[PDB]
Protein backbone atom coordinates (compact mmCIF):
# COMPACT_ATOMS: atom_id res chain seq x y z
CA UNK A 1 0.00 0.00 0.00
CA UNK A 2 2.92 2.36 -0.47
CA UNK A 3 5.79 3.75 1.16
CA UNK A 4 6.51 7.25 1.46
CA UNK A 5 8.58 9.65 3.70
CA UNK A 6 5.89 11.28 6.51
CA UNK A 7 6.80 14.04 9.06
CA UNK A 8 4.62 14.44 12.36
CA UNK A 9 1.52 16.60 11.94
CA UNK A 10 2.97 20.33 13.05
CA UNK A 11 -0.35 21.24 14.91
CA UNK A 12 0.83 21.82 18.34
CA UNK A 13 4.24 22.33 17.87
CA UNK A 14 3.49 25.97 15.75
CA UNK A 15 1.25 27.08 18.37
CA UNK A 16 4.27 27.80 20.58
CA UNK A 17 6.50 29.67 18.06
CA UNK A 18 7.33 32.68 18.90
CA UNK A 19 9.92 35.69 17.18
CA UNK A 20 12.71 37.52 19.07
CA UNK A 21 14.75 40.18 17.86
CA UNK A 22 17.58 42.17 20.05
CA UNK A 23 19.92 44.63 18.65
CA UNK A 24 20.20 43.57 15.45
CA UNK A 25 19.68 40.11 14.95
CA UNK A 26 16.59 38.59 14.57
CA UNK A 27 15.41 34.42 14.60
CA UNK A 28 12.84 32.17 16.56
CA UNK A 29 12.28 30.95 19.46
CA UNK A 30 9.79 28.22 21.71
CA UNK A 31 7.59 29.55 24.10
CA UNK A 32 6.78 27.14 26.48
CA UNK A 33 4.59 27.53 29.78
CA UNK A 34 6.15 31.31 30.47
CA UNK A 35 9.56 30.52 30.22
CA UNK A 36 10.57 31.48 26.30
CA UNK A 37 14.01 29.34 24.94
CA UNK A 38 16.04 31.07 22.52
CA UNK A 39 19.86 30.47 21.02
CA UNK A 40 22.67 32.16 23.05
CA UNK A 41 24.80 33.69 20.77
CA UNK A 42 21.73 36.54 20.00
CA UNK A 43 23.89 39.11 22.17
CA UNK A 44 26.77 38.43 20.36
CA UNK A 45 27.17 40.83 17.68
CA UNK A 46 29.08 40.93 14.11
CA UNK A 47 32.30 42.74 15.83
CA UNK A 48 31.90 39.73 19.08
CA UNK A 49 32.27 36.56 16.24
CA UNK A 50 36.17 36.22 16.60
CA UNK A 51 35.70 36.16 20.08
CA UNK A 52 32.77 36.44 22.27
CA UNK A 53 32.83 36.23 26.24
CA UNK A 54 28.94 35.76 27.20
CA UNK A 55 28.87 36.62 31.09
CA UNK A 56 29.90 39.76 30.25
CA UNK A 57 26.99 40.03 27.52
CA UNK A 58 24.94 38.26 29.82
CA UNK A 59 25.68 41.10 33.11
CA UNK A 60 25.04 44.17 30.50
CA UNK A 61 22.14 42.78 29.02
CA UNK A 62 18.47 44.59 30.65
CA UNK A 63 15.33 43.63 30.13
CA UNK A 64 13.96 46.67 27.81
CA UNK A 65 16.89 45.74 25.25
CA UNK A 66 15.23 42.52 24.20
CA UNK A 67 12.27 42.09 21.85
CA UNK A 68 10.02 39.21 22.10
CA UNK A 69 6.90 38.94 19.43
CA UNK A 70 4.42 36.55 18.91
CA UNK A 71 3.33 36.85 15.57
CA UNK A 72 2.23 40.63 16.08
CA UNK A 73 2.08 40.77 19.49
CA UNK A 74 4.99 42.04 20.98
CA UNK A 75 4.98 40.15 25.26
CA UNK A 76 7.05 41.74 27.93
CA UNK A 77 9.55 40.84 29.63
CA UNK A 78 10.31 40.82 33.72
CA UNK A 79 13.98 38.44 34.01
CA UNK A 80 16.54 36.77 32.13
CA UNK A 81 18.50 34.13 32.65
CA UNK A 82 21.42 32.00 30.72
CA UNK A 83 21.71 28.17 31.01
CA UNK A 84 24.67 26.00 29.42
CA UNK A 85 24.65 27.46 25.96
CA UNK A 86 20.92 28.58 25.32
CA UNK A 87 19.44 31.72 26.58
CA UNK A 88 16.32 31.25 28.28
CA UNK A 89 14.14 34.65 29.07
CA UNK A 90 11.37 34.86 32.02
CA UNK A 91 8.83 36.45 30.19
CA UNK A 92 5.55 37.27 32.01
CA UNK A 93 3.21 36.01 29.79
CA UNK A 94 2.58 32.43 29.88
CA UNK A 95 1.67 30.27 26.56
CA UNK A 96 -1.81 28.94 26.13
CA UNK A 97 -0.80 27.05 23.94
CA UNK A 98 1.63 25.31 25.65
CA UNK A 99 0.94 21.33 25.44
CA UNK A 100 2.35 18.42 27.09
CA UNK A 101 6.00 18.33 26.91
CA UNK A 102 9.26 16.14 27.56
CA UNK A 103 13.09 17.00 27.57
CA UNK A 104 15.14 14.38 25.44
CA UNK A 105 18.36 13.28 24.16
CA UNK A 106 18.47 11.34 21.05
CA UNK A 107 21.95 9.08 20.26
CA UNK A 108 22.73 8.80 16.56
CA UNK A 109 20.87 6.46 14.30
CA UNK A 110 16.90 7.98 15.96
CA UNK A 111 14.57 10.18 13.13
CA UNK A 112 12.88 13.11 14.82
CA UNK A 113 10.49 15.54 12.43
CA UNK A 114 12.02 19.61 11.90
CA UNK A 115 9.48 22.18 11.36
CA UNK A 116 11.39 24.80 9.74
CA UNK A 117 10.31 28.46 10.00
CA UNK A 118 11.48 31.64 9.11
CA UNK A 119 11.02 34.99 10.91
CA UNK A 120 8.98 33.42 13.41
CA UNK A 121 6.72 31.83 10.68
CA UNK A 122 6.40 27.90 10.28
CA UNK A 123 7.27 27.14 6.50
CA UNK A 124 7.49 23.35 6.65
CA UNK A 125 8.10 19.88 8.03
CA UNK A 126 10.33 16.88 7.02
CA UNK A 127 11.78 13.89 8.44
CA UNK A 128 15.62 13.60 9.55
CA UNK A 129 18.39 11.44 10.96
CA UNK A 130 21.05 12.00 13.82
CA UNK A 131 24.26 11.10 11.71
CA UNK A 132 27.20 9.02 13.78
CA UNK A 133 29.46 12.34 12.92
CA UNK A 134 26.64 14.01 15.10
CA UNK A 135 24.94 15.93 12.04
CA UNK A 136 21.71 16.81 10.28
CA UNK A 137 21.86 16.80 6.35
CA UNK A 138 18.67 19.30 6.26
CA UNK A 139 17.39 22.52 4.89
CA UNK A 140 18.13 25.85 5.89
CA UNK A 141 18.62 29.12 4.71
CA UNK A 142 20.07 32.31 6.58
CA UNK A 143 17.96 33.60 9.63
CA UNK A 144 16.76 30.13 10.14
CA UNK A 145 18.35 29.65 13.68
CA UNK A 146 15.94 28.42 16.63
CA UNK A 147 13.48 25.93 14.62
CA UNK A 148 13.31 22.93 16.95
CA UNK A 149 12.80 19.18 15.85
CA UNK A 150 10.21 17.32 18.31
CA UNK A 151 8.69 13.85 18.17
CA UNK A 152 5.49 13.00 19.48
CA UNK A 153 4.21 10.17 21.44
CA UNK A 154 0.26 10.00 21.80
CA UNK A 155 -0.12 13.16 23.61
CA UNK A 156 3.21 14.13 24.89
CA UNK A 157 5.70 16.24 22.78
CA UNK A 158 9.53 15.57 23.22
CA UNK A 159 11.65 17.81 21.67
CA UNK A 160 15.30 17.00 20.68
CA UNK A 161 17.28 19.33 18.32
CA UNK A 162 17.22 23.09 17.64
CA UNK A 163 19.11 24.87 14.90
CA UNK A 164 22.52 26.54 16.03
CA UNK A 165 24.73 27.22 12.84
CA UNK A 166 25.84 25.55 9.44
CA UNK A 167 28.92 23.90 8.91
CA UNK A 168 30.76 24.74 5.73
CA UNK A 169 30.30 21.56 4.13
CA UNK A 170 27.35 22.07 4.34
CA UNK A 171 25.84 20.36 7.66
CA UNK A 172 23.96 21.91 10.53
CA UNK A 173 24.68 21.32 14.24
CA UNK A 174 22.47 22.00 17.08
CA UNK A 175 21.85 21.39 20.80
CA UNK A 176 19.32 19.63 23.00
CA UNK A 177 16.65 21.79 24.66
CA UNK A 178 19.15 21.45 27.73
CA UNK A 179 22.11 23.37 26.18
CA UNK A 180 24.15 20.56 25.29
CA UNK A 181 26.00 20.64 22.27
CA UNK A 182 25.25 17.55 19.65
CA UNK A 183 28.74 16.00 19.14
CA UNK A 184 32.23 18.32 19.44
CA UNK A 185 30.98 21.89 18.28
CA UNK A 186 31.46 25.09 19.76
CA UNK A 187 29.42 28.21 18.55
CA UNK A 188 32.71 30.00 17.22
CA UNK A 189 33.78 30.73 13.92
CA UNK A 190 37.10 28.50 14.35
CA UNK A 191 37.92 25.17 12.52
CA UNK A 192 34.97 23.26 13.02
CA UNK A 193 34.10 20.54 11.35
CA UNK A 194 33.02 17.04 11.33
CA UNK A 195 34.58 13.65 11.28
CA UNK A 196 33.71 10.57 8.93
CA UNK A 197 30.33 9.38 8.10
CA UNK A 198 29.02 5.47 8.71
CA UNK A 199 25.63 4.68 6.68
CA UNK A 200 23.63 3.12 9.77
CA UNK A 201 22.75 -0.80 9.37
CA UNK A 202 19.41 -1.22 11.31
CA UNK A 203 17.71 1.58 9.11
CA UNK A 204 19.03 0.00 6.16
CA UNK A 205 17.42 -3.44 7.40
CA UNK A 206 14.50 -2.11 8.41
CA UNK A 207 14.17 -0.12 5.22
CA UNK A 208 14.42 -4.02 3.56
CA UNK A 209 12.42 -5.15 5.60
CA UNK A 210 9.25 -2.70 5.13
CA UNK A 211 10.03 -3.28 1.10
CA UNK A 212 9.52 -7.32 1.74
CA UNK A 213 6.19 -6.65 3.42
CA UNK A 214 4.97 -4.41 0.75
CA UNK A 215 5.39 -6.80 -1.97
CA UNK A 216 9.28 -6.14 -3.15
CA UNK A 217 10.83 -9.99 -2.79
CA UNK A 218 13.50 -10.34 -5.84
CA UNK A 219 16.59 -10.23 -3.71
CA UNK A 220 15.36 -12.80 -1.34
CA UNK A 221 18.02 -15.42 -1.15
CA UNK A 222 18.33 -19.06 0.49
CA UNK A 223 21.67 -18.69 2.64
CA UNK A 224 22.58 -18.09 6.22
CA UNK A 225 25.40 -16.73 7.86
CA UNK A 226 27.41 -16.15 11.22
CA UNK A 227 27.12 -12.70 12.51
CA UNK A 228 30.87 -11.66 13.02
CA UNK A 229 30.65 -12.31 9.16
CA UNK A 230 28.27 -9.62 9.32
CA UNK A 231 30.21 -7.61 11.65
CA UNK A 232 33.50 -7.63 9.65
CA UNK A 233 31.13 -6.94 5.86
CA UNK A 234 29.84 -3.94 7.78
CA UNK A 235 32.99 -2.29 9.31
CA UNK A 236 34.28 -2.99 5.82
CA UNK A 237 31.53 -1.78 3.30
CA UNK A 238 31.43 1.52 5.76
CA UNK A 239 28.79 0.37 7.88
CA UNK A 240 28.68 0.67 11.90
CA UNK A 241 28.70 -2.53 13.35
CA UNK A 242 25.70 -4.20 14.73
CA UNK A 243 25.19 -5.60 18.07
CA UNK A 244 22.83 -8.32 19.92
CA UNK A 245 20.31 -5.25 20.41
CA UNK A 246 20.37 -4.27 16.95
CA UNK A 247 19.84 -8.12 15.98
CA UNK A 248 17.16 -8.47 18.51
CA UNK A 249 15.05 -5.26 17.95
CA UNK A 250 14.47 -6.28 14.70
CA UNK A 251 12.06 -9.21 16.61
CA UNK A 252 8.58 -7.95 16.03
CA UNK A 253 9.14 -7.34 11.95
CA UNK A 254 10.76 -10.43 12.03
CA UNK A 255 8.32 -12.48 13.52
CA UNK A 256 5.73 -9.84 11.05
CA UNK A 257 7.27 -11.56 7.72
CA UNK A 258 8.53 -14.93 8.95
CA UNK A 259 11.96 -14.38 7.64
CA UNK A 260 15.57 -14.58 10.05
CA UNK A 261 17.55 -11.60 10.19
CA UNK A 262 20.91 -13.88 9.25
CA UNK A 263 19.00 -14.22 5.57
CA UNK A 264 18.46 -10.36 5.54
CA UNK A 265 22.26 -9.75 6.31
CA UNK A 266 23.21 -12.78 3.57
CA UNK A 267 20.82 -10.49 1.35
CA UNK A 268 21.98 -7.12 2.01
CA UNK A 269 26.14 -8.71 1.54
CA UNK A 270 25.10 -9.98 -2.09
CA UNK A 271 23.36 -6.18 -2.51
CA UNK A 272 26.58 -4.51 -1.67
CA UNK A 273 28.97 -6.71 -2.95
CA UNK A 274 26.98 -6.81 -6.77
CA UNK A 275 25.29 -3.91 -6.73
CA UNK A 276 21.32 -3.83 -7.16
CA UNK A 277 21.83 -5.28 -11.29
CA UNK A 278 19.96 -1.98 -12.25
CA UNK A 279 16.68 -2.87 -10.29
CA UNK A 280 15.30 -0.24 -7.92
CA UNK A 281 13.68 -0.84 -4.36
CA UNK A 282 10.47 0.91 -3.53
CA UNK A 283 11.25 3.63 -6.30
CA UNK A 284 15.35 4.33 -5.04
CA UNK A 285 18.18 2.98 -6.81
CA UNK A 286 20.49 3.37 -3.60
CA UNK A 287 19.84 2.14 0.07
CA UNK A 288 18.19 4.50 2.37
CA UNK A 289 19.35 4.54 6.15
CA UNK A 290 16.42 7.33 7.01
CA UNK A 291 14.12 4.58 8.53
CA UNK A 292 13.92 3.42 12.17
CA UNK A 293 12.49 -0.36 12.62
CA UNK A 294 9.71 2.13 15.09
CA UNK A 295 8.80 4.06 11.67
CA UNK A 296 8.80 0.86 9.82
CA UNK A 297 5.81 -0.90 12.22
CA UNK A 298 3.96 2.46 12.81
CA UNK A 299 3.55 3.01 9.07
CA UNK A 300 3.18 -0.74 8.16
CA UNK A 301 0.27 -1.08 11.05
CA UNK A 302 -1.40 2.63 10.98
CA UNK A 303 -0.59 4.01 14.50
CA UNK A 304 -2.19 7.12 14.87
CA UNK A 305 -2.10 10.14 17.22
CA UNK B 1 22.58 24.37 1.97
CA UNK B 2 20.46 21.11 1.82
CA UNK B 3 17.33 20.23 -0.47
CA UNK B 4 14.62 18.30 1.12
CA UNK B 5 11.05 17.35 0.55
CA UNK B 6 9.16 19.10 2.95
CA UNK B 7 4.85 19.70 3.47
CA UNK B 8 3.09 22.24 4.73
CA UNK B 9 2.59 22.65 8.11
CA UNK B 10 -1.35 20.93 9.14
CA UNK B 11 -2.15 23.41 12.02
CA UNK B 12 -5.24 24.90 10.62
CA UNK B 13 -6.22 21.82 8.52
CA UNK B 14 -5.96 19.07 11.49
CA UNK B 15 -8.56 21.47 13.43
CA UNK B 16 -11.38 20.87 10.79
CA UNK B 17 -10.94 16.99 10.68
CA UNK B 18 -13.69 15.03 11.85
CA UNK B 19 -14.92 11.51 12.02
CA UNK B 20 -18.18 10.00 10.89
CA UNK B 21 -19.93 6.52 11.58
CA UNK B 22 -22.89 4.87 9.15
CA UNK B 23 -23.97 1.37 9.70
CA UNK B 24 -21.02 -0.82 10.02
CA UNK B 25 -18.43 1.84 8.30
CA UNK B 26 -16.47 4.50 9.90
CA UNK B 27 -14.30 6.88 8.33
CA UNK B 28 -12.82 10.82 8.32
CA UNK B 29 -14.62 13.90 6.60
CA UNK B 30 -13.36 17.74 6.80
CA UNK B 31 -16.06 20.17 8.74
CA UNK B 32 -15.83 23.44 7.21
CA UNK B 33 -18.39 26.16 8.32
CA UNK B 34 -21.39 24.40 9.32
CA UNK B 35 -21.42 21.25 6.31
CA UNK B 36 -19.61 18.19 6.72
CA UNK B 37 -17.76 16.52 3.53
CA UNK B 38 -17.41 12.90 3.55
CA UNK B 39 -17.47 10.29 0.35
CA UNK B 40 -20.12 9.11 -1.09
CA UNK B 41 -20.02 5.56 -0.90
CA UNK B 42 -20.33 5.57 3.02
CA UNK B 43 -24.00 4.63 2.43
CA UNK B 44 -23.03 0.96 0.57
CA UNK B 45 -22.65 -1.91 2.38
CA UNK B 46 -21.01 -5.49 1.52
CA UNK B 47 -23.88 -6.14 -0.21
CA UNK B 48 -23.67 -2.59 -2.08
CA UNK B 49 -20.53 -3.58 -3.57
CA UNK B 50 -21.39 -5.02 -6.46
CA UNK B 51 -24.16 -2.58 -7.94
CA UNK B 52 -25.08 0.05 -5.87
CA UNK B 53 -27.82 2.53 -6.32
CA UNK B 54 -26.84 5.97 -4.28
CA UNK B 55 -31.03 7.85 -4.81
CA UNK B 56 -32.64 5.18 -3.09
CA UNK B 57 -29.93 5.10 -0.36
CA UNK B 58 -30.41 8.32 -0.02
CA UNK B 59 -34.01 8.69 -0.17
CA UNK B 60 -34.65 5.92 2.74
CA UNK B 61 -31.57 7.88 4.75
CA UNK B 62 -32.79 9.72 7.66
CA UNK B 63 -30.93 12.09 10.03
CA UNK B 64 -30.18 10.07 13.07
CA UNK B 65 -29.23 6.85 11.63
CA UNK B 66 -25.66 8.98 10.55
CA UNK B 67 -23.33 9.14 13.59
CA UNK B 68 -20.70 12.03 13.58
CA UNK B 69 -17.31 12.33 15.57
CA UNK B 70 -15.50 15.66 16.24
CA UNK B 71 -13.24 13.57 18.57
CA UNK B 72 -15.10 12.60 21.47
CA UNK B 73 -17.81 15.05 20.29
CA UNK B 74 -21.15 14.24 18.89
CA UNK B 75 -22.63 16.75 16.78
CA UNK B 76 -26.50 17.46 15.79
CA UNK B 77 -27.24 16.84 12.09
CA UNK B 78 -30.62 18.35 10.40
CA UNK B 79 -30.15 17.48 7.03
CA UNK B 80 -28.62 15.75 4.43
CA UNK B 81 -27.59 16.23 0.69
CA UNK B 82 -25.93 15.32 -2.23
CA UNK B 83 -22.89 17.06 -4.67
CA UNK B 84 -22.07 14.77 -7.61
CA UNK B 85 -20.03 12.08 -5.95
CA UNK B 86 -19.71 13.54 -2.66
CA UNK B 87 -22.38 13.55 0.48
CA UNK B 88 -22.90 17.07 2.23
CA UNK B 89 -24.44 16.50 5.56
CA UNK B 90 -25.79 19.79 7.28
CA UNK B 91 -24.64 19.97 10.50
CA UNK B 92 -26.05 22.38 12.96
CA UNK B 93 -22.90 23.26 14.83
CA UNK B 94 -20.59 25.33 13.08
CA UNK B 95 -16.88 24.82 13.02
CA UNK B 96 -14.58 27.77 14.87
CA UNK B 97 -11.62 26.14 12.97
CA UNK B 98 -12.51 26.57 9.41
CA UNK B 99 -9.88 28.96 7.91
CA UNK B 100 -9.64 30.86 4.54
CA UNK B 101 -10.70 28.10 2.06
CA UNK B 102 -10.78 27.67 -1.54
CA UNK B 103 -11.94 25.13 -3.63
CA UNK B 104 -10.10 24.32 -6.89
CA UNK B 105 -9.34 21.29 -9.43
CA UNK B 106 -5.80 20.84 -10.16
CA UNK B 107 -4.24 19.86 -13.17
CA UNK B 108 -1.77 16.89 -13.48
CA UNK B 109 1.84 17.37 -12.52
CA UNK B 110 1.01 19.72 -9.73
CA UNK B 111 2.36 19.22 -5.97
CA UNK B 112 0.60 19.19 -2.60
CA UNK B 113 0.25 17.75 0.75
CA UNK B 114 -1.81 15.08 2.18
CA UNK B 115 -2.53 14.88 5.77
CA UNK B 116 -2.92 11.29 5.97
CA UNK B 117 -5.69 10.36 8.98
CA UNK B 118 -7.26 7.21 10.57
CA UNK B 119 -10.56 7.08 12.75
CA UNK B 120 -10.62 10.55 12.48
CA UNK B 121 -7.20 11.74 14.04
CA UNK B 122 -3.79 12.95 11.95
CA UNK B 123 -1.13 10.50 11.43
CA UNK B 124 1.36 11.80 9.14
CA UNK B 125 1.99 14.98 6.72
CA UNK B 126 3.95 14.13 2.90
CA UNK B 127 4.03 15.31 -0.28
CA UNK B 128 2.95 13.76 -3.75
CA UNK B 129 1.98 14.62 -7.26
CA UNK B 130 -0.36 14.07 -9.70
CA UNK B 131 0.70 11.39 -12.61
CA UNK B 132 -0.82 11.92 -15.76
CA UNK B 133 -2.54 8.88 -15.75
CA UNK B 134 -4.43 10.46 -12.87
CA UNK B 135 -3.32 8.96 -9.86
CA UNK B 136 -1.48 9.41 -6.90
CA UNK B 137 1.49 7.26 -5.35
CA UNK B 138 0.45 7.30 -1.98
CA UNK B 139 0.81 5.18 1.44
CA UNK B 140 -2.50 5.00 2.85
CA UNK B 141 -4.12 1.72 4.69
CA UNK B 142 -7.66 0.32 5.41
CA UNK B 143 -9.99 2.91 6.99
CA UNK B 144 -7.91 5.71 5.52
CA UNK B 145 -10.64 6.79 2.66
CA UNK B 146 -11.48 10.78 3.51
CA UNK B 147 -7.73 12.37 3.98
CA UNK B 148 -7.64 15.68 2.04
CA UNK B 149 -4.93 16.59 0.49
CA UNK B 150 -4.37 20.46 0.48
CA UNK B 151 -2.42 23.45 -0.40
CA UNK B 152 -1.49 26.80 1.35
CA UNK B 153 -1.40 30.49 0.17
CA UNK B 154 -0.23 32.48 2.69
CA UNK B 155 -3.39 32.77 4.68
CA UNK B 156 -6.06 30.54 2.12
CA UNK B 157 -5.82 26.66 1.79
CA UNK B 158 -6.78 25.28 -1.16
CA UNK B 159 -7.99 21.61 -1.14
CA UNK B 160 -7.53 19.94 -4.14
CA UNK B 161 -8.06 15.84 -3.63
CA UNK B 162 -9.36 13.60 -1.14
CA UNK B 163 -8.93 9.93 -0.95
CA UNK B 164 -11.62 6.97 -2.29
CA UNK B 165 -10.56 3.57 -3.06
CA UNK B 166 -7.08 2.19 -3.73
CA UNK B 167 -6.50 0.52 -7.00
CA UNK B 168 -5.30 -3.13 -8.00
CA UNK B 169 -2.21 -2.06 -9.29
CA UNK B 170 -1.32 0.07 -5.87
CA UNK B 171 -2.10 3.50 -6.22
CA UNK B 172 -5.26 5.30 -5.26
CA UNK B 173 -7.40 7.58 -7.02
CA UNK B 174 -9.86 10.10 -5.31
CA UNK B 175 -12.09 13.09 -6.52
CA UNK B 176 -11.93 16.67 -5.72
CA UNK B 177 -13.90 18.94 -3.47
CA UNK B 178 -17.15 19.34 -5.66
CA UNK B 179 -17.42 15.85 -6.43
CA UNK B 180 -15.50 15.33 -10.31
CA UNK B 181 -13.88 11.78 -10.62
CA UNK B 182 -10.03 12.77 -11.05
CA UNK B 183 -9.38 10.40 -14.53
CA UNK B 184 -11.85 7.71 -15.79
CA UNK B 185 -12.71 6.06 -12.19
CA UNK B 186 -15.71 5.04 -10.70
CA UNK B 187 -16.67 4.35 -6.70
CA UNK B 188 -17.28 0.84 -7.96
CA UNK B 189 -16.19 -2.81 -7.24
CA UNK B 190 -15.63 -3.90 -10.80
CA UNK B 191 -12.63 -3.40 -14.03
CA UNK B 192 -10.97 -0.60 -13.21
CA UNK B 193 -7.25 0.16 -13.75
CA UNK B 194 -5.00 3.42 -14.80
CA UNK B 195 -3.40 3.78 -17.92
CA UNK B 196 0.09 4.25 -19.01
CA UNK B 197 1.73 6.79 -17.27
CA UNK B 198 5.00 8.85 -18.01
CA UNK B 199 7.31 11.27 -16.57
CA UNK B 200 6.69 14.75 -16.11
CA UNK B 201 9.79 17.03 -18.05
CA UNK B 202 9.31 20.40 -15.84
CA UNK B 203 9.93 18.84 -12.47
CA UNK B 204 12.86 16.86 -13.98
CA UNK B 205 14.37 20.30 -15.75
CA UNK B 206 13.13 21.69 -11.70
CA UNK B 207 15.15 19.86 -10.08
CA UNK B 208 18.15 19.91 -12.02
CA UNK B 209 18.24 24.10 -11.74
CA UNK B 210 17.73 23.51 -8.05
CA UNK B 211 20.48 20.74 -8.00
CA UNK B 212 22.87 23.27 -9.88
CA UNK B 213 21.95 26.42 -7.40
CA UNK B 214 23.35 24.18 -4.67
CA UNK B 215 26.44 23.60 -6.33
CA UNK B 216 26.36 20.06 -8.00
CA UNK B 217 27.09 21.37 -11.63
CA UNK B 218 29.31 17.92 -12.72
CA UNK B 219 26.88 17.62 -15.64
CA UNK B 220 26.59 20.74 -16.89
CA UNK B 221 28.07 20.50 -21.07
CA UNK B 222 28.64 23.25 -23.64
CA UNK B 223 25.47 22.32 -25.88
CA UNK B 224 22.89 23.60 -27.81
CA UNK B 225 19.70 21.97 -29.05
CA UNK B 226 16.56 22.72 -30.86
CA UNK B 227 13.03 22.60 -29.55
CA UNK B 228 11.46 19.50 -31.73
CA UNK B 229 14.89 17.69 -31.12
CA UNK B 230 13.55 17.78 -26.99
CA UNK B 231 10.05 16.68 -28.12
CA UNK B 232 11.50 14.62 -30.04
CA UNK B 233 13.73 12.81 -27.23
CA UNK B 234 11.12 13.14 -24.52
CA UNK B 235 8.42 11.28 -26.76
CA UNK B 236 11.39 8.85 -26.89
CA UNK B 237 12.46 8.08 -23.32
CA UNK B 238 8.37 8.16 -22.66
CA UNK B 239 8.72 11.61 -21.51
CA UNK B 240 5.57 14.30 -21.18
CA UNK B 241 6.45 16.18 -24.82
CA UNK B 242 7.84 19.83 -23.92
CA UNK B 243 5.66 23.42 -24.92
CA UNK B 244 6.39 27.19 -25.24
CA UNK B 245 4.47 27.79 -21.72
CA UNK B 246 7.06 25.16 -19.99
CA UNK B 247 9.98 26.99 -21.94
CA UNK B 248 8.65 30.27 -20.28
CA UNK B 249 7.94 29.12 -16.99
CA UNK B 250 11.32 28.24 -16.12
CA UNK B 251 12.50 31.88 -16.74
CA UNK B 252 13.35 32.95 -13.36
CA UNK B 253 15.11 30.07 -12.27
CA UNK B 254 17.26 30.04 -15.71
CA UNK B 255 17.70 33.81 -15.21
CA UNK B 256 18.78 33.11 -11.26
CA UNK B 257 21.45 30.76 -12.76
CA UNK B 258 21.97 32.51 -16.31
CA UNK B 259 22.10 28.87 -17.65
CA UNK B 260 20.22 28.26 -20.71
CA UNK B 261 17.32 25.86 -20.95
CA UNK B 262 18.14 24.78 -24.38
CA UNK B 263 21.89 23.84 -22.63
CA UNK B 264 19.78 21.89 -20.11
CA UNK B 265 17.65 19.92 -22.14
CA UNK B 266 21.11 19.01 -24.23
CA UNK B 267 22.05 18.31 -20.51
CA UNK B 268 19.50 15.92 -19.97
CA UNK B 269 19.55 14.55 -23.33
CA UNK B 270 22.89 13.07 -22.57
CA UNK B 271 22.06 11.92 -19.00
CA UNK B 272 19.05 9.78 -20.31
CA UNK B 273 21.21 8.61 -23.33
CA UNK B 274 24.25 7.94 -20.71
CA UNK B 275 22.81 7.73 -17.95
CA UNK B 276 24.36 9.09 -14.33
CA UNK B 277 28.14 7.33 -14.72
CA UNK B 278 27.48 6.07 -10.70
CA UNK B 279 27.48 9.48 -9.88
CA UNK B 280 24.28 10.77 -7.79
CA UNK B 281 22.58 14.12 -7.80
CA UNK B 282 21.08 15.84 -4.17
CA UNK B 283 21.66 12.13 -3.02
CA UNK B 284 19.97 10.33 -5.19
CA UNK B 285 20.71 7.98 -7.99
CA UNK B 286 17.49 8.22 -10.08
CA UNK B 287 15.63 11.12 -11.96
CA UNK B 288 13.03 12.92 -9.57
CA UNK B 289 9.97 14.60 -10.96
CA UNK B 290 7.66 15.86 -8.10
CA UNK B 291 9.32 19.47 -7.80
CA UNK B 292 7.30 21.58 -9.54
CA UNK B 293 9.46 24.86 -10.22
CA UNK B 294 7.09 26.62 -7.60
CA UNK B 295 8.50 24.45 -5.10
CA UNK B 296 12.25 25.23 -6.10
CA UNK B 297 12.31 28.78 -6.26
CA UNK B 298 9.81 28.70 -2.64
CA UNK B 299 12.38 26.36 -1.20
CA UNK B 300 15.68 28.26 -2.08
CA UNK B 301 14.40 31.59 -1.50
CA UNK B 302 12.89 31.02 2.00
CA UNK B 303 9.44 31.97 1.39
CA UNK B 304 7.53 31.72 4.56
CA UNK B 305 3.39 31.72 5.60
Given at each position: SGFRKMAFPSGKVEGCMVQVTCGTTTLNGLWLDDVVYCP?????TSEDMLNPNYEDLLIR????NFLVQAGNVQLRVIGHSMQNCVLKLKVDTANPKTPKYKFVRIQPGQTFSVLACYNGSPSGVYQCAMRPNFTIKGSFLNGSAGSVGFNIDYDCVSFCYMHHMELPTGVHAGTDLEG???????????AQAAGTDTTITVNVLAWLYAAVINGDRWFLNRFTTTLNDFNLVAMKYNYEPLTQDHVDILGPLSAQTGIAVLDMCASLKELLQNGMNGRTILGSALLEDEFTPFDVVRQCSGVTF
Open positions: RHVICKSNHNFYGPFVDRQT
